[PDB]
Amino acid sequence: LAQPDGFDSIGRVSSFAALRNLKPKKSGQHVLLTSYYDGWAAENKMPTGGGEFISSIGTATDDGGYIAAGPGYYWTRVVNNNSFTAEDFGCKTTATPPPNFNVLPAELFDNTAMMQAAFNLAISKSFKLNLSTGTYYFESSDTLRITGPIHIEGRPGTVFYHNPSNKANPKTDAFMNISGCSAGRISSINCFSNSYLGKGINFDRSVGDNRKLVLEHVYVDTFRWGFYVGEPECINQIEFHSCRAQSNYFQGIFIESFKEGQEY
Amino acid sequence: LAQPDGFDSIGRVSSFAALRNLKPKKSGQHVLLTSYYDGWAAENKMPTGGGEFISSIGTATDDGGYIAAGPGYYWTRVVNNNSFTAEDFGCKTTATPPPNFNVLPAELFDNTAMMQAAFNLAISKSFKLNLSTGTYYFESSDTLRITGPIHIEGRPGTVFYHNPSNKANPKTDAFMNISGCSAGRISSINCFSNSYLGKGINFDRSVGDNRKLVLEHVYVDTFRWGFYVGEPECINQIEFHSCRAQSNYFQGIFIESFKEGQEYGHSAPVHFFNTICNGNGPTSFALGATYKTTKNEYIKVMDSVNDVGCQAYFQGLSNVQYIGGQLSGHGSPRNTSLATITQCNSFIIYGTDLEDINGFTTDGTAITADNIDAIESNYLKDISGAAIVVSSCPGFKIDSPHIFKIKTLSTIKLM
């Protein structure tokens, strides 16, 4: 142990799935999670979603990245500096494809269910979500929703790739939906779809007003619409500080409160 | 130790108080601190202020969260990424109370002495202080002082609750005091008191000038004044990027470099960006309200029955830009104006939302369409009677805003 490389003798858990099957001894046990998925050495990469966990004996709902529940026990992730990464929930990145039409990334892993769980934790626990560089692939029938104030800070090169397939009426469905995000912070996210279909980001009144919401370096490209607002009293004091809506089929920014027939 | 749970065999220190009594062996010992306070498992929560410490043999002053001093030794906390949390010094959060008057949080733990220690470390070591979500409770007699450049970053839901009790002259004392914070950054802090008493944030020259200080998403609500400045050459290049001053008894923004008798003094240039002042004036309820302190004492909120207020008050400034904000009185507060500009130079407005003024005069006479003819004759030289009253400001400019619901004599008054 006193050797210069004595830290390797300590045992760890290989993957997050093995953590669900780790029956603890008491309600104060500490373990080390090496990575969310095992086999990172053969893939010539480094662990991403590891950390430290503390055991319990009661009953809790399996979060996916925050709570690893089991039969009569569960583990809770120790969050540092009130911040966590999307890789802590099982999200995978890949190489960014060119902005050519109908060009898909090399690997196709749907991160919709994983990112939705990461968004729910950052809203319910008020933790800052850190996004890694690379391309997050999204091919699902559900919309990625932000239903509360959230702090998202991406890196240079963070890409959200939306595949309009699997969407019922894929011409007008929104990829991301923001509602009730009062005094939120979203930064450094480049969302494109390489298909002139769908809405990039849709601001709604499903939860509440997006009062004093701040967007910085948010890029929306290759969609039927970049920023879509079709409801009054939802973007009251919204702010765009350095944003880009580029190559979207009808409009890059579309804000229409009311239409002909309904009042002011 | 080769098992999947071999990391639990290593021993830890339970609390920060136990770390003070941990006599080491030499000046190179490493130890793991689980949490600042012990007993987090019974409280059904997680450890907050833990970390790793390194031993020494010399003598050092006990910081509270950075140095755990003992007899002939002390431990030093290892800081990562030049950042630390307020929980590392012993601060506790609680559930946020509603913004109702004289409503206190559920748990009452004073975090003033521990937050002051965290502020001192972030200023002396130039570390970034991270604030957790929840309500920090302050019920002390001293003012929370920032006496140097600091980087503070809060979370969505960080609340600084100030209790005006245990404070001599609780009607005019300041909760926070910022001085000498040059090129500092403060973000995402919501300070309210639920009592229309005290100053929210006070800027002064006790240490130096707050040159190029940047405030973002700083909310001040339920105080006698939201942002208070009563000294020249202290906010020379301050910036408000998206701030809110809401439901204060008198004003949301009060800047006055000098008063009568004193000669000229100013700060320049002041920058306001997307800042909103809403609902800041004496209201029907506030005038008749009485604040009950924790010591079972009653304080009358009103100074007089003819108390009148405003949303933003500016005096003795130069080159002030108010870019795309909002000045509005919601809840019908008694206001003489929405913005009062007095003895300024080059005050320019860029597309500010202005609405919902409750017209009153300085002495407390309600401006009504019935007596609109007696107001112009008897109150011509009064600093009131418009949504924006400009007095002795040469380079004024308003630049075509959208205005509505104006229940006073005019929209702009010049004198």
Side-chain angles (χ1 to χ4, degrees), chain B residues 163-351:
Chain B
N163 197 334
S165 314
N166 295 117
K167 189 167 285 291
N169 324 296
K171 186 166 289 187
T172 57
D173 268 350
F175 163 53
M176 206 175 309
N177 193 13
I178 308 179
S179 195
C181 189
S182 296
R185 303 193 69 88
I186 307 172
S187 313
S188 296
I189 305 184
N190 180 17
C191 316
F192 64 90
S193 178
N194 289 350
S195 68
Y196 305 99
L197 294 166
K199 304 174 174 63
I201 298 181
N202 182 77
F203 303 91
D204 62 335
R205 204 80 186 277
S206 57
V207 175
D209 188 11
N210 299 278
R211 197 166 297 267
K212 281 199 165 302
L213 171 63
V214 168
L215 305 188
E216 293 180 353
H217 275 154
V218 179
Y219 298 170
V220 184
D221 320 299
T222 64
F223 281 101
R224 189 153 299 249
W225 302 277
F227 298 95
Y228 199 96
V229 169
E231 203 160 350
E233 298 277 314
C234 72
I235 52 169
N236 274 327
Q237 291 176 56
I238 201 173
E239 300 176 20
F240 301 82
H241 279 309
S242 64
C243 294
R244 188 185 77 184
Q246 190 178 54
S247 299
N248 306 110
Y249 185 75
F250 275 129
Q251 274 93 25
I253 293 180
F254 187 92
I255 302 176
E256 191 189 44
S257 295
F258 64 98
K259 295 184 294 183
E260 294 295 328
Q262 323 173 11
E263 86 287 8
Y264 178 72
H266 78 110
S267 280
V270 194
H271 314 109
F272 287 97
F273 201 50
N274 300 338
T275 299
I276 173 169
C277 296
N278 189 81
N280 307 291
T283 55
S284 56
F285 163 84
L287 280 162
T290 309
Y291 182 76
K292 183 181 181 176
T293 67
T294 58
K295 293 186 286 185
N296 294 157
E297 294 294 328
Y298 297 92
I299 301 173
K300 293 179 179 179
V301 173
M302 86 175 189
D303 307 1
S304 62
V305 304
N306 297 326
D307 271 3
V308 287
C310 183
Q311 312 292 144
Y313 179 83
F314 307 98
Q315 198 276 336
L317 295 176
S318 298
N319 296 293
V320 183
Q321 294 96 21
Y322 194 87
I323 302 179
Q326 182 171 329
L327 305 169
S328 56
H330 277 264
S332 299
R334 299 150 57 97
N335 293 331
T336 59
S337 295
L338 294 173
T340 298
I341 309 162
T342 313
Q343 303 187 86
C344 291
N345 283 285
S346 179
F347 203 111
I348 314 177
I349 295 178
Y350 300 93

Side-chain angles (χ1 to χ4, degrees), chain A residues 9 11 30 82 126 185 212, chain B residues 1 3 8 155-156 216 274:
Chain A
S9 306
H30 295 71
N82 313 285
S126 288
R185 287 304 187 107
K212 306 192 77 61
Chain B
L1 295 174
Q3 296 296 111
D8 190 49
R155 287 292 168 258
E216 293 180 353
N274 300 338

Side-chain angles (χ1 to χ4, degrees), chain B residues 94-109:
Chain B
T94 179
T96 300
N100 317 340
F101 171 83
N102 205 355
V103 173
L104 292 177
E107 291 84 4
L108 308 182
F109 176 76

